[PDB]
């Protein structure tokens, strides 16, 4: 008898429609600057906010993807190397795909935490515990 299954399914669907009416669409367009020998990315702070991501971890991940060196200037990242905006856009796309939003379900409110020395991710909307560090 699967009758008392559809009712609690209905209850769950009403829960979903109550909690999450909106059911990412919040990625700032990475408008970059390629000044020949130099490259300046101003959007680094905005993409830090709209993805709820702390700046230092994001910029170190960017430096870990591509072996290029520079500095951080001002609310912007100043890397002296050669990259089209498409490729840094692609790197940000990878980081968005595998860090800000989980592959299994649509969510974003998760953030960095340190659970016995690495960076162990946890969520807020759900309560996840996934060991994503590298």
């Amino acid at each position: 008898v699967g009758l008392p299954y559809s009712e609690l399914l209905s209850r769950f669907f009403n829960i979903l429609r109550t909690n999450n009416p909106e059911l990412k669409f919040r990625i700032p367009p990475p408008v970059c600057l390629r000044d020949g020998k130099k490259t300046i990315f101003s959007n680094i702070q905005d993409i830090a906010e709209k993805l709820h991501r702390s700046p230092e971890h994001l910029i170190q991940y960017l430096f870990a993807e591509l072996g290029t060196s520079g500095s951080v200037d001002g609310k912007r990242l100043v890397i002296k190397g050669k990259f089209q905006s498409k490729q840094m856009e692609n790197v940000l796309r990878r980081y968005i795909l595998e860090y800000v939003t989980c592959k299994t379900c649509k969510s974003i409110n998760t953030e960095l935490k340190r659970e016995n020395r690495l960076f162990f991710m946890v969520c807020k909307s759900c309560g996840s515990t996934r060991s994503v560090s590298s």
Partner: protein, 470 residues
């Protein structure tokens, strides 16, 4: 201005605390729901089964709140070989006024006797209907001995199916058939992913799941849609467990026994050795009431090979330091719940996977180790766990003489050789020791496609015994 820790204390002492168990209670009049038993140990073992990488630890964590944690750096992420344990307290609201679906509440093991209702508007308290243990069964296609043994432990089943993925998950069916092998009916079907489907997709998935459950032995399985991540619809799961699943027949008549699945050396590093503790066997008790201070013997134990290649078996005598169950040290042990029996054994026996699936008997009983075992087998039509791309799920062949196969005798994970094949009967020679106590429901797996594959069930009919050296 009370701190949250002060608030939680005040509620804990207000909830009756956790009273100490009586040292010597009259055991003839004790039932598994008794206040001394129900408050401080788990009387029913519920086991999680599901497809790989869908979430079975998370459902248990959402129910109780006790982390399986997951370990071994590399195993932190892929799969865990050992089982996952957690205790939940089942609390029902004493007020009839609150709706019946949400009155149930599953709390962690440290909750009080009667904690307050978190529903806004109900001053009623919670009564403890039962305490339950959870045995997280790994669901990988390579790891099969641990799943069979954890099954051999548990008494209630919990099936997880993901919605957006394909309906006929094969190793989920393998889990269900393994459950059917050991004589369990009480299975609750869970839909792990329901938020991520549409209304029509969820109904289609339910229709498919129902269409799968027509030929199997289990017929009236409850189906309930939950979410391990969103953490909702927990109370009705407790409802279904309480209503559908009663206590298996387990009283104090049967002689004492143990079945160890896990080994845990207790050697806190950095600490000086002059302050140490014994070796702990993580074992389940299906029969036997154990009290603080007892002499017990691990029957297969020391397994040696002489100069002549003969296997000598030395039982591990041991005195029980403590019977660690649930949260606190307990004066008596309840059958039907996994417990850490800490004994004087050297922790090097309980460091690695050494005491995984081994029989134990207190002093005052003589189980028999065997070397040849007569076994009565019966197989299914097809192998479970192979996604053939549309072509006739592989049919089980008839067994050959002299073939190494994994024969899970209760908890024991042994690789035996067939010395003779008959119409329904076989004889298995073992190099890894195995004992026989009563029947020890057995699972059979072959090596056809690299990793082990379940084929059918069996029960011992006879065997050639060995006399342990004293």
């Amino acid at each position: 201005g009370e701190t949250e820790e002060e608030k939680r204390k005040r509620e804990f002492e207000e909830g009756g605390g956790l009273p100490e168990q009586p040292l010597n209670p009259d055991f003839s009049k004790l039932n598994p729901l008794s206040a001394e038993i129900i408050n401080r140990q788990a009387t029913i073992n519920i086991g999680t089964i599901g497809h790989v990488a869908h979430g079975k630890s998370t459902v248990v964590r959402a129910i109780s709140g006790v982390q399986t944690v997951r370990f071994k750096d590399e195993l932190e992420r892929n799969i865990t070989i050992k089982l996952g344990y957690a205790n939940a307290k089942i609390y029902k609201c004493q007020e009839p006024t609150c709706p019946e679906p949400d009155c149930y509440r599953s709390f962690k093991s440290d909750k009080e006797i009667s904690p307050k209702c978190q529903r806004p508007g109900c001053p009623g308290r919670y009564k403890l209907v039962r305490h339950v243990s959870f045995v997280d069964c790994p669901g990988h296609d390579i790891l099969m001995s641990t799943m069979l043994s954890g099954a051999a432990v548990m008494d209630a089943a919990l099936l997880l199916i993901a919605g957006n993925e394909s309906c006929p998950q094969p190793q989920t069916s393998e889990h269900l058939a393994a459950i059917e092998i050991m004589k369990l009916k009480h299975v609750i079907i869970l839909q792990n992913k329901v938020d991520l489907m549409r209304e029509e997709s969820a109904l289609e998935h339910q229709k498919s799941i129902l269409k799968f459950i027509r030929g199997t032995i289990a017929d009236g399985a409850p189906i309930v849609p939950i979410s391990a991540q969103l953490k909702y619809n927990i109370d009705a799961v407790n409802e279904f467990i309480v209503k559908t699943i009663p206590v298996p027949p387990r009283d104090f008549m049967i002689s004492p026994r143990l079945i160890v699945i896990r080994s845990f050396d207790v050697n806190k590093p950095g600490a000086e050795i002059e302050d140490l503790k014994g070796g702990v066997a993580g074992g389940s008790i299906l029969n036997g009431v154990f009290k603080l201070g007892d002499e017990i013997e691990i029957r297969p134990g020391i397994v040696t090979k002489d100069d002549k290649g003969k296997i000598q078996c030395k039982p591990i005598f041991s005195n029980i330091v403590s019977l660690f169950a649930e949260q606190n040290d307990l004066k008596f042990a309840v059958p039907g719940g996994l417990i850490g029996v800490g004994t004087k054994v050297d922790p090097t026996l309980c460091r690695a996977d050494r005491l995984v699936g081994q029989v134990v008997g207190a002093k005052g009983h003589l189980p028999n180790i065997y070397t040849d075992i007569e076994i009565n087998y019966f197989l299914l039509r097809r192998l479970l766990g192979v996604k053939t791309d549309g072509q006739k799920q592989a049919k089980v062949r008839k067994l050959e003489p002299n073939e190494v196969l994994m024969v899970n005798i209760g908890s024991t994970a042994t690789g035996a050789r067939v010395v003779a094949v008959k119409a329904d009967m076989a004889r298995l020679q073992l190099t890894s020791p195995a004992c026989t106590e009563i029947n020890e429901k057995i699972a059979l797996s072959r090596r056809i496609e690299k990793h082990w594959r379940l084929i059918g069930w069996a029960t011992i009919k006879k065997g050639t015994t060995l006399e342990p050296i004293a």
